[PDB]
Amino acid sequence: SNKINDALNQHYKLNVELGLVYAHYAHVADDEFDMPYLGKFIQHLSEDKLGVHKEYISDYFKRNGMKLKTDVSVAVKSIPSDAKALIQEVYARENEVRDHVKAIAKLALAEDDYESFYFIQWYVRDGLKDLTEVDDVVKLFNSSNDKLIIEETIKEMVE
Amino acid sequence: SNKINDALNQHYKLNVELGLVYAHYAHVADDEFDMPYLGKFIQHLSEDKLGVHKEYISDYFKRNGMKLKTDVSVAVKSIPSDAKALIQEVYARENEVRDHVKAIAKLALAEDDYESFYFIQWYVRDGLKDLTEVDDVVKLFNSSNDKLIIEETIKEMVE
Amino acid sequence: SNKINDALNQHYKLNVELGLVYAHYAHVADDEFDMPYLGKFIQHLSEDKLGVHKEYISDYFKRNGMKLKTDVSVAVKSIPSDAKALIQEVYARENEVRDHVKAIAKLALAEDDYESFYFIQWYVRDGLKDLTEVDDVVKLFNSSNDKLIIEETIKEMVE
Amino acid sequence: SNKINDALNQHYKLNVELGLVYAHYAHVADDEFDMPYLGKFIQHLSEDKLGVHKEYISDYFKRNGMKLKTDVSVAVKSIPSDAKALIQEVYARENEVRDHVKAIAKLALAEDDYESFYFIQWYVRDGLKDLTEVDDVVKLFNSSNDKLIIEETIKEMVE
Amino acid sequence: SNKINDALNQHYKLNVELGLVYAHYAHVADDEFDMPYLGKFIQHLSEDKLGVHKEYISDYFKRNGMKLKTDVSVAVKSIPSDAKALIQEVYARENEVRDHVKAIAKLALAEDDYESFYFIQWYVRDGLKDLTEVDDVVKLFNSSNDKLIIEETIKEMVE
Amino acid sequence: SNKINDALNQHYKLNVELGLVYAHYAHVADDEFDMPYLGKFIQHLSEDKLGVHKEYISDYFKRNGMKLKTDVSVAVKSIPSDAKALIQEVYARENEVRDHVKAIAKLALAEDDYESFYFIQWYVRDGLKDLTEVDDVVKLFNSSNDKLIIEETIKEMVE
């Protein structure tokens, strides 16, 4: 399906662009906000998006004959003002990923593309786990007013 | 130094953009040219550029107080016509990286930035090894007319 | 070079005098400020300066024929008022060390003393790592108002 | 006791200043007198004085409430003329240490400071062992006219 | 750079020619001067110069595109008269190597050849260690009048 | 025997000069002809000639009282045009070595020098094995038109 090919190419672009934004946010968490474990948490998200998250699509295209497109444009022009806002922004972007992944599943059933429906199954499930891990971190900031206490808790999540 | 900060931000951008191009070329080597080990060779170059090659700069900025900029724009709009041309293009881009890395070293001595001169030392040395590994592969294509013989030789270089 | 010999003798004196000051500060961190892990952190800096930091120079002189001078004068006549100020003072002295080490590198190139330029390379690189470790500790004091939380974090840095 | 506090601060100063002198003598033994094992023997004495010898006092002050003073002034302005003279000078300084340590013990009993009397017990005993080890080396120079034979014997004492 | 290519070809020639001279001196140390451990010490220097010392240059040329020249002319037409003189001559030749290596470093910075500057860094550092090891042996001959005592000491340096 | 001494000194010179030529040929095999395993094969021949092949003679002289002469002159002024020609030239030089070694054996029996006859026995036997190993490689070039197939076969001979 051309429409599935386009939607998965769009998802490839999103994984790349968010990975590059997260790499920036991870640097800022450590460098500006004094939170190196928040930085490590966000760096692992960055490495996933620039790693297996994009390679699964590229490899899927190799098997079903679809075409890969590389077209990337992203600039980090402002930064959230503090660390809570930073992880809140990460969360908002991970929810956008959920919406897109669900749209792809719906479209695959529409087009009777059961290979793509089964392929996208991993994203549906795994992305919900990624979103809850991110949500847990956001909340640390409502459970403690102390940045070093929050860091200690995050340390167990990047373990 | 502002000028060193700018040049290292430019080198960060180059590592990112080439990493994304190499990821595309690795896919094409396997998918279109039937050369999965050429694909693996090019994928390892992609993973280096999107990995430690960019993280060393970002981490260096954290120590000396420089500012990181994320501004990325790259589109793969044409593909070399066969596998020799593909690895020849990779080689040409790796030589552009050599030129930039040398310009940074020269500028660091000019500015009496001995921390940056010592930091760039790794790129000078390592990039020469990366360029010779790439040059070895290009040459396989002049040593054999058989794609499966070349693949077998490449297999020992991605080992 | 006489001028390099003088500058490295001055750096030997600085390492000795700061080592003795840091030994005092480490005692005060534990004894007056109730922070024994801050004390241990500062004691390891003291042991480096009175240990390998000075022995590398002395050993370097043995190989290139330079002359060692021992002329030491230091008195600790006032103490910073609290623990944050104490580690802030440590940081200010470590930046003075960076400035001197860079001056030596510049002078070695001027004099075409490539042995000394290569010998000072370790100080340039390593001193930047020491300065960032110290800067991390200073910041704990902006990330937490609780001395026992900061101690727990420092414990992982003296590990 | 103020008088014990002063005498132990004086002993701290002596350990520091002799440690710095011994570090110089160790360098000269190797560099000028061609005796690197004599150098190693004297370096271990230097490391003791700048290490545990001074840290025991500093740590003792932490327990009994005394105050530490850092006030150091030492310059190495002449060097003994040959290696026998060098180790003979070391011996003379180690005897001065014996005299001071004994004065502290006598004063502690006078002041009914039984904690300090018991604390100084280690210095009384250990310093006698250090003085006999040094005396053994001095004598090598009366038992052999050959510097390489003496070095071989010293090698077993720095083992 | 042609001038760097020429200077490194000259350094390749020097390593070869000195290696052949040292091989002769090692034979003479054992055969004529009854000092087989002095012979072994000098043989290891010979094997370094005819081994990695020359192969590093040859391999460096392979990576940066320079041209290797083999043009060798050396004759051992006289021999130092005793063993001290023999190791003194070795020392004089190792100092000539230091001078040439430094000239290459200076020229590389002049030509903005930062690859060659970084490549020559090993020679600058390592050659200073080789020169001090050789200087230690020369001195044995001033520390003992007995050839079998000196041999025993050398035995620990060829270990 | 003076005549045996001269012939073994000539054989020492030949081993040295061929070793230096082979070192050049090994570099060219890899650098110009894209055959790094041919290069490794030729490098091992180079290391033998500059190593044990010459040290056996030098050590033999030490036992029977003969005199060693070092007089070396060799320049590589042209290179065979392709890789087959290169290994063919190596073969021709190894046959010259066979002729000289046989002349020495004949002369030793003439002079009733049974020590030299027995000493040269190793060269007679071993040099025939070296010549057949070289001949096997030459032939690869008649058994395959593909340089990467030949390389793979050579890989098992440098194993």
Ligand SMILES: [Cl-]
């Ligand atoms: Cl389907």
Ligand SMILES: [Cl-]
């Ligand atoms: Cl600097």
Ligand SMILES: [Cl-]
């Ligand atoms: Cl130099």
Ligand SMILES: [Cl-]
């Ligand atoms: Cl008491």
Ligand SMILES: [Cl-]
């Ligand atoms: Cl360069």
Ligand SMILES: [Cl-]
């Ligand atoms: Cl015989």
Ligand SMILES: [Fe+3]
């Ligand atoms: Fe920080």
Ligand SMILES: [Fe+3]
């Ligand atoms: Fe994951």
Ligand SMILES: [Fe+3]
């Ligand atoms: Fe349907």
Ligand SMILES: [Fe+3]
């Ligand atoms: Fe395929």
Ligand SMILES: [Fe+3]
């Ligand atoms: Fe790498």
Ligand SMILES: [Fe+3]
């Ligand atoms: Fe300058």
Ligand SMILES: [Fe+3]
């Ligand atoms: Fe306390």
Ligand SMILES: [Fe+3]
């Ligand atoms: Fe350190």
Ligand SMILES: [Fe+3]
């Ligand atoms: Fe200059």
Ligand SMILES: [Fe+3]
């Ligand atoms: Fe010495």
